[PDB]
Structures are given as structure tokens and as C-alpha cells.
Design a protein around this ligand. Structure first.
Ligand SMILES: N[C@@H](CCC(=O)N[C@@H](CS)C(=O)NCC(=O)O)C(=O)O
Ligand SMILES: N[C@@H](CCC(=O)N[C@@H](CS)C(=O)NCC(=O)O)C(=O)O
Ligand SMILES: O=c1c(-c2ccc(O)cc2)coc2cc(O)ccc12
Ligand SMILES: O=c1c(-c2ccc(O)cc2)coc2cc(O)ccc12
Ligand SMILES: [Ca+2]
Ligand SMILES: [Ca+2]
Ligand SMILES: [Ca+2]
Ligand SMILES: [Ca+2]
Ligand SMILES: [Ca+2]
Ligand SMILES: [Ca+2]
Lengths: 218, 218
């Protein structure tokens, strides 16, 4: 009866990782959305800052629980809605495999992605030199290893760990594109992700919006 | 019978978050250590790079499971060794509260900490201007809110989420000290952490080592 409320702006890759998860879990009707538009600065309103001192999206509120990181939101939603399905995290080693890749997205891929994208968005960077994209390419190399050792990022099955990564990969891809030559396992995985039926609505919409803003800044 | 193996260098805050956890869980005898000395560049040896393409510590190997982020190592260890104790993560909301603060350490506190510490370690930064420490102070402000709303970082009880944060707080503290004036809840929490019986061995040893290296670079 109690519905989680997702505070979100789908231009954000972390948000889209959540939106992808909600869709894959089949719980779109079970999660209420509350738009928090970054470019309008609604994330700096007193109510939202009180909700999350990081003044960032996404945020999940469920009863009195407040999660302020897309990755914790994703694992929490798997725990309460996905325990008995294909995305289950009940097994401790499977849970750890998935969490390990969520950590990789949060602490490596999204960090390096964000540096570049925030730089362009706020005009701190004007020209992308190679040194801007080198950390992203190092993250691609790690991802290529992971996708050599298993079919998806965390194991041979799709898991929620694939969603934040693809959300990031489809963002920073527009400034640091994947080479099939250089990263064949990752390019193939990315195409497969793109074929998911909920990808268009849960991720591409927001990516296109961000592409509009990026073409405007460039 | 199967023992996890922890690849570690205790100058690293992520490592010390693990060491603190292993001690708090009372499982020092149950986790084998394997030293991987960063300043000797043992993390760049072929075997270790194959183990972890991020060439970073800590790493946990348990049977064929390989975790390559201190935060995933911590949750995994809680799951297999702490399920029936004071650090249990069995309840989904408690698990999410703890994971949410682990995310905060991984993606905010340790990121901003690491930027500064790596800068000094490799002499990219020579003088700490205020702009180097401003992001760290913003992270302190968030932490002060969290510790206003609960006695420890994630709830009113000590949890494993307190250990990575204190590991970071005791590192970047040496260049950006806490003010009791400015962050009273956090200063009090930090002192309490320092009083834990395993703090000296699991965290202070490594902090002191790093202080030696930092005085050498400065
Ligand atoms: N580690 C966080 C990162 C969230 C994040 O950085 N969100 C950005 C958008 S991509 C934001 O809301 N930025 C607004 C701000 O920083 O004020 C997560 O995964 O939720
Ligand atoms: N998010 C990772 C970060 C680990 C990390 O950055 N480790 C550092 C030491 S603090 C390292 O081993 N650096 C060596 C390198 O980057 O080559 C975790 O929490 O385990
Ligand atoms: O920082 C980012 C913003 C943003 C944040 C605040 C604001 O006022 C406007 C845009 C929007 O989208 C993003 C997407 C990214 O991939 C990384 C950073 C941002
Ligand atoms: O980058 C860090 C190293 C380090 C990494 C590689 C190397 O060759 C030497 C030191 C050691 O300790 C640290 C502690 C920190 O808190 C942050 C970064 C580092
Ligand atoms: Ca509805
Ligand atoms: Ca408007
Ligand atoms: Ca208000
Ligand atoms: Ca032993
Ligand atoms: Ca030696
Ligand atoms: Ca070898």
C-alpha cells in the first residue's frame, strides 16, 4: 500500500539507472515519480535540500526511509520488489557480484563521466583534449575485461548492475564513443542493452534531452 | 573452511574501512591477509592486475568470488559473517540505510578526500588553497546533518557504514581538520569512533604511516 516516491530528472544517468531498474522489475505502477528539474534548480529548494543535503537526484522516499544514491535505491528496490524474480539478490555471492559492479559505476565510471559532462555543461571545459577522456577510456578497458569474463557486467545474466552502467555509457558515449575495434565485448553488450524494450523510454528520452543541452553548450 | 583473502595496504582508507569491519565483526582469524604495498607498486604486478583491472586495494577473494571495492567487501562480509549479530544487515531497510551511507563514503567523501591526498602524494598540489578543501568541507556538512539525525552515520547504532567514513575522516582530517565549533556532532562521533578498542590497530597504524609519507612530501 505504501508506495516509494522517486525524486528524479531523467537527464541524470544515476536517475536513468533507477528508471531502467523500475522498468526491468515491472514496478512502474508501484513507484510514484516526483520531478525535480536540475536546469530549473528545483534541487536547491529548501524542501529538497532538507530531504537530501547533497541536493542531487535521484532520491527515494519510502515511509520514513530516505535513500540518496541511485545505487542504494536500486539495491533496495530489488530487495523489496524483486526477491522472487530474475533480478533477485537473495544469494549473498550474487548480491556481492552485483554490488561490486554498482560500486564500479558509482566510484569509477560515473565519477569520471560526471567530471567531463559537468565541465561541458558549465563551460569549464571548452575543448575536449585527450587527457579529459583518458580516465573514461581506462574505465572502458575495465568494463571490457568484465564483459570478457561474463556475458553481462556482473555475471552471465542481466542484473540491475547493468542499468547504471548503461545509463552512464550512453551519456559519456556522446563525447567519448566506443570503438568496436578497441572494446568489442562492450560495444556488443551496449547494443544488446539498447534492444531492451524499456530502454527507449527509461533511458533514451533523457539521453536525447541531454544531447540537446550539450549541442546548445557546444 | 574456505577463508576469504584480503589484498590490502593499510595506508589506504578503503582498506582500513575493511580492517575496521573485520575487527568489529570479530573475524580477524577468519580472513587471511595478503599484503600489496602501494608505494612499492606491487599493485601493478601482472597477477594483481589480472585479479583487479583497477589495480587498487582492497580486493577480497573468496573461492571464485572477487570483490574489487571496499564497500562491496564490507557488505559481503556482513552477509556471510555478521547475519546474527549487532552489525546484521538482514532487515531490508536497515541494509538500505547502511548501503546509502556506504555510497556516500564511496562516491562523495572518499572521492573528494582522494583527490587531495593523491595530489599531495604525487606533488601535483604544492599549496592547499581553500578551493582544494571546500568539497571536503561540504562533505563534512552533509555528515553533520546525518549525525544530527542519528547517533551514528546510518542509524542510532554503530554499523559497518561508520567504518569507511571514519577511515576517510581520519585521513583527510590531517589536511582539513574538524572544527568542534563548525561540526560538533561529527567531532563527537569521531572521538567516540577513536575510542573503539580495535581502532588503534585497524586504522591508526595505517594513518600514522600515511602521516609519515605526507610529512615527507611536505
Ligand atoms: N552517486 C549519486 C550521484 C547523483 C548525482 O550526482 N546526481 C546529479 C545529476 S547526474 C545531480 O543531481 N546534481 C545536482 C547537484 O550536484 O547539485 C547517485 O548515484 O545517485
Ligand atoms: N572505491 C574503491 C577505491 C579503492 C582505491 O582507490 N584504492 C587506492 C588506495 S586509497 C589504490 O589502491 N590506488 C592505487 C592505484 O590507483 O593504482 C574502494 O573503496 O575499494
Ligand atoms: O551536473 C549535471 C547536470 C546539472 C546539475 C545542476 C544544474 O543546475 C544543471 C544541470 C545535469 O545533467 C548531468 C548529466 C551528467 O551525466 C553529469 C552531470 C550532470
Ligand atoms: O593514491 C594513494 C596511495 C598510493 C597509490 C599508488 C602508489 O604508487 C603510491 C601511493 C596511497 O595512499 C593513499 C591514501 C589516500 O587517502 C588517497 C590516495 C592514496
Ligand atoms: Ca501512479
Ligand atoms: Ca519550467
Ligand atoms: Ca521548507
Ligand atoms: Ca591466519
Ligand atoms: Ca620492500
Ligand atoms: Ca601472471
Amino acid at each position: 500500500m505504501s508506495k516509494p516516491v522517486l525524486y528524479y530528472d531523467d537527464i541524470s544517468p544515476p536517475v536513468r539507472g533507477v528508471l531502467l531498474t523500475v522498468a526491468a522489475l515491472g514496478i512502474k505502477d508501484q513507484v510514484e515519480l516526483k520531478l525535480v528539474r536540475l536546469f530549473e534548480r528545483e534541487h536547491l529548494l529548501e524542501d529538497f535540500v532538507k530531504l537530501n543535503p547533497l541536493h542531487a537526484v535521484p532520491v527515494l522516499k519510502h515511509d520514513d526511509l530516505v535513500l540518496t544514491d541511485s545505487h542504494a535505491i536500486i539495491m533496495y528496490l530489488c530487495d523489496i520488489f524483486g526477491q522472487d524474480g530474475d533480478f533477485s539478490l537473495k544469494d549473498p555471492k550474487q548480491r556481492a557480484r552485483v554490488h561490486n559492479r554498482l560500486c564500479f559505476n558509482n566510484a569509477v565510471l560515473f565519477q569520471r563521466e560526471s567530471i567531463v559532462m559537468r565541465g561541458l555543461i558549465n563551460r569549464s571545459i571548452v575543448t575536449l583534449e585527450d587527457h579529459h577522456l583518458k580516465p573514461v577510456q581506462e574505465a572502458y578497458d575495465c568494463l571490457e575485461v568484465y564483459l570478457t569474463n561474463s556475458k553481462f557486467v556482473a555475471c552471465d545474466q542481466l542484473t540491475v548492475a547493468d542499468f547504471p552502467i548503461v545509463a552512464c555509457m550512453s551519456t559519456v558515449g556522446m563525447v567519448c564513443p566506443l570503438s568496436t575495434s578497441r572494446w568489442p565485448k562492450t560495444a556488443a553488450w551496449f547494443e544488446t542493452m539498447k534492444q531492451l524494450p524499456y530502454y527507449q523510454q527509461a533511458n533514451q528520452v533523457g539521453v536525447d534531452k541531454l544531447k540537446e543541452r550539450l549541442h546548445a553548450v557546444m
